[PDB]
Amino acid sequence: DIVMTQSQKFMSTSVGDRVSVTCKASQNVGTNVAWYQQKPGQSPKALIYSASYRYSGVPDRFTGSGSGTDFTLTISNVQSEDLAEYFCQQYNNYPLTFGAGTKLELKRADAAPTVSIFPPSSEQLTSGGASVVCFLNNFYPKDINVKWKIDGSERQNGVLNSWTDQDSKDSTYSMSSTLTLTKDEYERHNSYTCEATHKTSTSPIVKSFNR
Amino acid sequence: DIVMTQSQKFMSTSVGDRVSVTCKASQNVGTNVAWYQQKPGQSPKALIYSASYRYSGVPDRFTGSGSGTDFTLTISNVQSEDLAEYFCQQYNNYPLTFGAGTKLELKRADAAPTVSIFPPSSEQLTSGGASVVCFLNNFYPKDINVKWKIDGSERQNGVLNSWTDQDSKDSTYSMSSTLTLTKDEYERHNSYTCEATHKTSTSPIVKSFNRN
Amino acid sequence: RADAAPTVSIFPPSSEQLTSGGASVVCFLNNFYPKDINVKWKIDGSERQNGVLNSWTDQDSKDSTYSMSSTLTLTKDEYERHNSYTCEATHKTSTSPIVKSFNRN
Amino acid sequence: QVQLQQPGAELVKPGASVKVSCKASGYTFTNYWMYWVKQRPGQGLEWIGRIHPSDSDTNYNQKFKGKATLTVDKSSSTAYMQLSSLTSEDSAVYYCAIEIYDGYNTMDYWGQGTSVTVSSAKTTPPSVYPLAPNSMVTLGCLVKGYFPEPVTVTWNSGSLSSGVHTFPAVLQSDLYTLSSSVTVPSSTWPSQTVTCNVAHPASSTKVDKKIVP
Amino acid sequence: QVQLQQPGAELVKPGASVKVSCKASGYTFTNYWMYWVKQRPGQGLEWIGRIHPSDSDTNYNQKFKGKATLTVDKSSSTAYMQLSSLTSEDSAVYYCAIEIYDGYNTMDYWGQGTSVTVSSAKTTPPSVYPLAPGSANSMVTLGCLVKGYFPEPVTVTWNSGSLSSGVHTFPAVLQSDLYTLSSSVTVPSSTWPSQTVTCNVAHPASSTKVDKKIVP
Amino acid sequence: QVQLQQPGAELVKPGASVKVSCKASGYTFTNYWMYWVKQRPGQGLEWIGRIHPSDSDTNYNQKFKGKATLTVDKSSSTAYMQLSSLTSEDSAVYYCAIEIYDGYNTMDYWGQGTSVTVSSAKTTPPSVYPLAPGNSMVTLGCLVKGYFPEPVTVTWNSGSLSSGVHTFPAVLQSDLYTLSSSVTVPSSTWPSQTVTCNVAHPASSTKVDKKIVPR
């Protein structure tokens, strides 16, 4: 089949600036090239058809160029709402083939996380389980270390970590960390500490509670 | 199976007073006993669990007590809305078994029935049948007798009678009596009479209509 | 109707009221019979009568019982000078009063 | 629908006057006598007078002869009762009422009544304070320091009417204070929002106070 | 809102089988025991069994082992009780119920109950006749005759439930394989005949909904 | 309005088959090609095939020759893609889509995508737990624990509360999925007003509204 390359897996820029994506086709696909946008959790959205023509509702900021084998998608005046994965696709020959996809990244200043800790709810305790949840919201860059302490001893098991994609409002990152214990194990200890280590400070951000 | 014996099939009191229904377990069930209230035509509602603990929304007027084999449900400040059947239940042993149920009754003063009679509707007369209906509403006590007279002659064939439970507002009873005839036989007579005999009067309450 | 013991509820002053320099401790005595009832306010175990205002409802249109709200109103300074606030209800339904109380702490 | 609309309250100075209005609607205004009844707080019913809107024909109680004046405005379907030289004895609720017989049934229709307060004190809106603390839970609402009467207190805009006890107001230094309790299932509060709605038409005050834990 | 949804009634021939459904919503279906209770017409409550929808673990009353089978469908959050080899003793109302303790309070939740009728007769919708007083007080009593239906139950309301006070709905009586009940309402003479009074009758076993106005 | 309605999730045992539906409405069904796209989790887009509902003419990708079969039902204006002999590699989101050029503008319309999960595990509905605190703002949360399969939809106050919301991607652990969601609101909003976490799990027909109650 015809192969659409897209050499870059990630593209970076700042809010208000511009970015571009190349797409290399293994053979001549004329101008029968389309560009799609996919935000996380949503269906793909067609941006460009026929190499350079926009679909209805696609703003001027998205411009497609190229013919033959070298096609480029250019996004100007980039805003945080443009955070998505972008695919090229040829429809000049069958079967229809897509590019690997290029995800947009937005550079910005560092930001320390706002950390919040939540004890197990009374409802969960009736189920025999006990989850302690620690939210780490709106930090940058995405790299962050989180540790759990139970009465001074570290626990690195039964922890479920999940990171959001880059925030569509302020380009920051957020992280949820869940320490799950049995109700008996939970009631056999007092202090439950959540420690966040981020490059914004050498001192960890500490949130704790005594049950 | 554990036998949950509610000694009384009926419990009686007055509005604002208190009533207590007992329940006897054949074996020691600890305090694993529940109580249920079921008003007529409605699903059962749980009142007490663990012999003495109330379900959410159950007023404090409902209290449970007892341990082992003797248990008691007590309803304080009884209102007409508390008219229902009350079941004890054991869940300490399998299978789970209920009591037979104790129906609550409210004592009140006598009340003469309000009697209304209704000729067959013109809509029913198109079907070939004719029903004469007599409502006897809001009387006490429950014992009442209705006699259907067709042109001054007693008719007891084709009489359908139905009594409600004690009313949840004033603790009275109501009765509906329907005399069903064919269309041709209904038109063969003129005077249709509903006579109500109740202890609130030596003379029957009479309601009549003439087919003309 | 038959006699009925009251349901006693005590309520400390709201934080919204404390911003105004005033403080009212409210005690509710609901659904009792007969109407005769005595309420004693105990501030740190000491009976207080100054600043207490009482109000009775009319006979309840559902169960024919009576209800009464007793409110002890004092200044915010006088409020935070004590800790134990107690509402005691003496009724003919029992010799021992029904005691509802709270602590500031 | 036949109805008689009266204002809830009127605050008038001692020695001054008041003019209670009764806006009639839903019927021919000039077809029925308009009656006026005075009720002191905690007392019985007294008859002030009556007036026919057709020609302003009047029958007066001699007690209120020199004080009460009855008039009507037919262009607005409104009847008025004016009191003069107001004393503290004139502080009362004043009702307008009609009786309609239509050849089949006899219906009576009453206005809500106008609480007339004769006082040199000025209006004060109420301060509404929440009262937050088994299978049942008791909530409360404190309506402190308003003048004059009345206030209207409901729960959840009237949707919560069972288990409510609204206690009569007490007077202290020209200020009224009442409380209202409500008892709801433990599953209702604090799970769902319970709101105390207080209306004081004398001060044009409408305050909704949610009972928050 | 936690809800258990049961159909109102089921009519099954003797010897056949029926599957009662209890559709759950508003909560985690697999977190609480599903209970089933039987109530014969005029009799008391009997416990059939319980099933935990998480793993379909069951506790059966030995009286109903061969008769009742409890299953669940987690993909639709529905519990099923199948009754087999139906006899006259199986004509009853069957309730599904759950009990939720949330760490603060304990609440019970019941389905409306499914009225199972074991009979060889077919369905018959009710005839609804208005009961208007004779030609020519401060209060007037109106009525509604719901005649000749099968099987139970029927629902009777006045003005779509707006009229609740002064209502007397009488229990149905079985005669010649047909049920008949009546309902009366007492309203002010200023209400009727000036305003419409409507008898709303629903018979789910025949997909019947009749609104009968009481016309003078 | 032009719409393409697709079911949320389909849980099919390995070796079995499944039929994914795409109900069209608001336009002439037989006037536009219907495209089908497959997207495996964390992967890219793959073209399955296309079909014209007028005459059921099809263009297939040879990769999905014996795997996918496209059909249409013109009486219901519904397109179907049947997947056969299901394996783990078939677990993906499946989109239907059309392209309309009305002589003025070119618009694309997509279905929501059907999350087909191939597994021997049975459905498990989620357990929704409130996250209430023990400043000018307050952060509330919602723990959606132990469900299968994907997906679940989480909204706050039926979507009326959208700003300051972070919904975290689901993590698979011990054959079950779990995610969480946080919302930050003015301190004058909570606990004075109601804050409700709305969780929807279509694979189990579950809709749970959990209010964030202070203690």
Short mmCIF file of N, CA, C and O in Angstrom, two decimals, chain F residues 102-154:
data_model
loop_
_atom_site.label_atom_id
_atom_site.label_comp_id
_atom_site.label_asym_id
_atom_site.label_seq_id
_atom_site.Cartn_x
_atom_site.Cartn_y
_atom_site.Cartn_z
N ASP F 102 -22.67 19.92 -0.54
CA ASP F 102 -23.99 20.36 -0.97
C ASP F 102 -23.94 21.32 -2.16
O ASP F 102 -24.95 21.96 -2.46
N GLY F 103 -22.80 21.42 -2.84
CA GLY F 103 -22.63 22.42 -3.86
C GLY F 103 -22.16 23.77 -3.35
O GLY F 103 -21.87 24.66 -4.16
N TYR F 104 -22.08 23.94 -2.03
CA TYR F 104 -21.56 25.16 -1.43
C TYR F 104 -20.40 24.87 -0.49
O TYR F 104 -19.31 25.42 -0.68
N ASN F 105 -20.60 24.01 0.50
CA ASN F 105 -19.57 23.68 1.48
C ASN F 105 -19.46 22.17 1.62
O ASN F 105 -20.38 21.42 1.30
N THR F 106 -18.30 21.73 2.11
CA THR F 106 -18.03 20.32 2.36
C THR F 106 -17.98 20.10 3.87
O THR F 106 -17.14 20.70 4.55
N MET F 107 -18.87 19.25 4.37
CA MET F 107 -18.95 18.95 5.79
C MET F 107 -18.70 17.47 6.03
O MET F 107 -19.12 16.63 5.23
N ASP F 108 -18.01 17.16 7.12
CA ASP F 108 -17.84 15.79 7.58
C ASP F 108 -18.70 15.56 8.81
O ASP F 108 -18.85 16.45 9.66
N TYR F 109 -19.27 14.36 8.91
CA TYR F 109 -20.07 13.96 10.05
C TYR F 109 -19.61 12.59 10.52
O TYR F 109 -19.45 11.68 9.70
N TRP F 110 -19.38 12.45 11.82
CA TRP F 110 -18.87 11.22 12.39
C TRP F 110 -19.81 10.71 13.47
O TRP F 110 -20.47 11.49 14.17
N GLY F 111 -19.86 9.39 13.61
CA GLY F 111 -20.47 8.80 14.78
C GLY F 111 -19.56 8.92 15.99
O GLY F 111 -18.38 9.24 15.89
N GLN F 112 -20.14 8.65 17.16
CA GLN F 112 -19.36 8.73 18.39
C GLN F 112 -18.32 7.63 18.49
O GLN F 112 -17.38 7.76 19.29
N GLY F 113 -18.45 6.56 17.71
CA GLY F 113 -17.53 5.45 17.79
C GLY F 113 -17.98 4.39 18.77
O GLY F 113 -18.38 4.71 19.90
N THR F 114 -17.92 3.13 18.36
CA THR F 114 -18.30 2.01 19.21
C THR F 114 -17.05 1.34 19.74
O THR F 114 -16.21 0.86 18.97
N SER F 115 -16.91 1.31 21.07
CA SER F 115 -15.76 0.69 21.72
C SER F 115 -16.01 -0.81 21.82
O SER F 115 -16.70 -1.27 22.73
N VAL F 116 -15.46 -1.57 20.88
CA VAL F 116 -15.58 -3.02 20.89
C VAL F 116 -14.44 -3.59 21.72
O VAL F 116 -13.26 -3.39 21.40
N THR F 117 -14.78 -4.29 22.80
CA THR F 117 -13.81 -4.94 23.66
C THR F 117 -13.97 -6.45 23.53
O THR F 117 -15.07 -6.98 23.75
N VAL F 118 -12.89 -7.13 23.16
CA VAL F 118 -12.88 -8.58 23.02
C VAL F 118 -12.23 -9.15 24.27
O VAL F 118 -11.02 -8.97 24.49
N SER F 119 -13.01 -9.84 25.09
CA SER F 119 -12.51 -10.39 26.34
C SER F 119 -13.45 -11.48 26.81
O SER F 119 -14.62 -11.54 26.43
N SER F 120 -12.92 -12.36 27.66
CA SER F 120 -13.72 -13.38 28.32
C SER F 120 -14.32 -12.88 29.63
O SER F 120 -15.16 -13.58 30.21
N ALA F 121 -13.91 -11.71 30.10
CA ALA F 121 -14.46 -11.16 31.33
C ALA F 121 -15.88 -10.67 31.10
O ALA F 121 -16.27 -10.31 29.98
N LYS F 122 -16.67 -10.66 32.17
CA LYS F 122 -18.03 -10.17 32.11
C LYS F 122 -18.09 -8.69 32.49
O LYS F 122 -17.12 -8.11 32.99
N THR F 123 -19.24 -8.08 32.24
CA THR F 123 -19.43 -6.67 32.54
C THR F 123 -19.45 -6.45 34.05
O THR F 123 -19.99 -7.26 34.81
N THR F 124 -18.84 -5.35 34.49
CA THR F 124 -18.90 -4.92 35.88
C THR F 124 -19.19 -3.43 35.92
O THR F 124 -18.46 -2.63 35.32
N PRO F 125 -20.26 -3.01 36.60
CA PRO F 125 -20.57 -1.58 36.69
C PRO F 125 -19.66 -0.89 37.69
O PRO F 125 -19.17 -1.53 38.63
N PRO F 126 -19.42 0.41 37.53
CA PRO F 126 -18.48 1.10 38.42
C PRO F 126 -19.09 1.44 39.77
O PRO F 126 -20.30 1.61 39.91
N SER F 127 -18.22 1.53 40.77
CA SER F 127 -18.58 1.97 42.11
C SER F 127 -18.15 3.43 42.25
O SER F 127 -16.95 3.73 42.24
N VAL F 128 -19.12 4.33 42.38
CA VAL F 128 -18.88 5.76 42.37
C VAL F 128 -18.78 6.25 43.81
O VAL F 128 -19.73 6.11 44.59
N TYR F 129 -17.63 6.83 44.16
CA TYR F 129 -17.39 7.29 45.52
C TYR F 129 -17.15 8.80 45.53
O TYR F 129 -16.50 9.33 44.63
N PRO F 130 -17.66 9.50 46.54
CA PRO F 130 -17.44 10.95 46.62
C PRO F 130 -16.10 11.28 47.25
O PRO F 130 -15.61 10.58 48.14
N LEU F 131 -15.50 12.36 46.77
CA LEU F 131 -14.24 12.87 47.30
C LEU F 131 -14.49 14.27 47.83
O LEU F 131 -14.45 15.25 47.08
N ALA F 132 -14.75 14.37 49.13
CA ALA F 132 -14.99 15.61 49.84
C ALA F 132 -13.82 15.93 50.76
O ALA F 132 -13.19 15.02 51.31
N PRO F 133 -13.49 17.21 50.93
CA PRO F 133 -12.33 17.56 51.76
C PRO F 133 -12.55 17.20 53.22
O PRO F 133 -13.68 17.10 53.71
N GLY F 134 -11.44 17.01 53.93
CA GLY F 134 -11.48 16.69 55.34
C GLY F 134 -12.01 17.83 56.18
O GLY F 134 -11.54 18.07 57.29
N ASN F 135 -9.68 28.52 52.10
CA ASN F 135 -9.14 29.08 50.87
C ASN F 135 -10.25 29.67 50.00
O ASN F 135 -11.43 29.46 50.27
N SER F 136 -9.86 30.40 48.96
CA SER F 136 -10.82 31.01 48.05
C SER F 136 -11.45 30.01 47.09
O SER F 136 -12.53 30.27 46.56
N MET F 137 -10.79 28.87 46.86
CA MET F 137 -11.32 27.81 46.02
C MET F 137 -11.28 26.50 46.78
O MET F 137 -10.54 26.34 47.75
N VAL F 138 -12.10 25.55 46.34
CA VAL F 138 -12.15 24.21 46.91
C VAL F 138 -12.14 23.20 45.77
O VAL F 138 -12.80 23.40 44.74
N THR F 139 -11.38 22.13 45.94
CA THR F 139 -11.28 21.07 44.95
C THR F 139 -12.09 19.87 45.44
O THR F 139 -11.85 19.36 46.54
N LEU F 140 -13.04 19.43 44.62
CA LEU F 140 -13.84 18.24 44.88
C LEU F 140 -13.48 17.16 43.87
O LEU F 140 -12.83 17.42 42.85
N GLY F 141 -13.91 15.93 44.15
CA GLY F 141 -13.50 14.82 43.32
C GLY F 141 -14.52 13.71 43.25
O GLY F 141 -15.52 13.70 43.97
N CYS F 142 -14.24 12.75 42.36
CA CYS F 142 -15.13 11.63 42.10
C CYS F 142 -14.28 10.43 41.70
O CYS F 142 -13.51 10.52 40.75
N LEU F 143 -14.43 9.32 42.42
CA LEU F 143 -13.66 8.10 42.16
C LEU F 143 -14.58 7.07 41.52
O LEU F 143 -15.54 6.62 42.14
N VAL F 144 -14.27 6.71 40.27
CA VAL F 144 -15.06 5.75 39.51
C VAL F 144 -14.27 4.44 39.43
O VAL F 144 -13.43 4.27 38.54
N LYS F 145 -14.56 3.51 40.33
CA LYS F 145 -13.68 2.39 40.61
C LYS F 145 -14.26 1.06 40.13
O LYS F 145 -15.45 0.78 40.32
N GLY F 146 -13.40 0.24 39.52
CA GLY F 146 -13.67 -1.16 39.28
C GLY F 146 -14.77 -1.48 38.29
O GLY F 146 -15.69 -2.24 38.61
N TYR F 147 -14.68 -0.93 37.08
CA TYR F 147 -15.66 -1.21 36.04
C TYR F 147 -15.01 -1.90 34.86
O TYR F 147 -13.78 -1.88 34.69
N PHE F 148 -15.85 -2.52 34.03
CA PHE F 148 -15.41 -3.20 32.81
C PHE F 148 -16.62 -3.46 31.93
O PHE F 148 -17.67 -3.89 32.43
N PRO F 149 -16.52 -3.22 30.61
CA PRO F 149 -15.34 -2.65 29.97
C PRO F 149 -15.44 -1.13 29.81
O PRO F 149 -16.32 -0.50 30.38
N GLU F 150 -14.52 -0.57 29.03
CA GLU F 150 -14.60 0.83 28.67
C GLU F 150 -15.80 1.06 27.75
O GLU F 150 -16.27 0.13 27.10
N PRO F 151 -16.32 2.30 27.69
CA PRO F 151 -15.90 3.49 28.42
C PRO F 151 -16.86 3.88 29.54
O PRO F 151 -17.85 3.19 29.78
N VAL F 152 -16.55 4.98 30.22
CA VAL F 152 -17.49 5.66 31.09
C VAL F 152 -17.43 7.15 30.79
O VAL F 152 -16.37 7.69 30.44
N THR F 153 -18.57 7.81 30.91
CA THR F 153 -18.67 9.25 30.74
C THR F 153 -18.89 9.89 32.10
O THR F 153 -19.76 9.46 32.86
N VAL F 154 -18.10 10.91 32.41
CA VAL F 154 -18.21 11.65 33.66
C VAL F 154 -18.48 13.11 33.33
O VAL F 154 -17.75 13.72 32.55
#
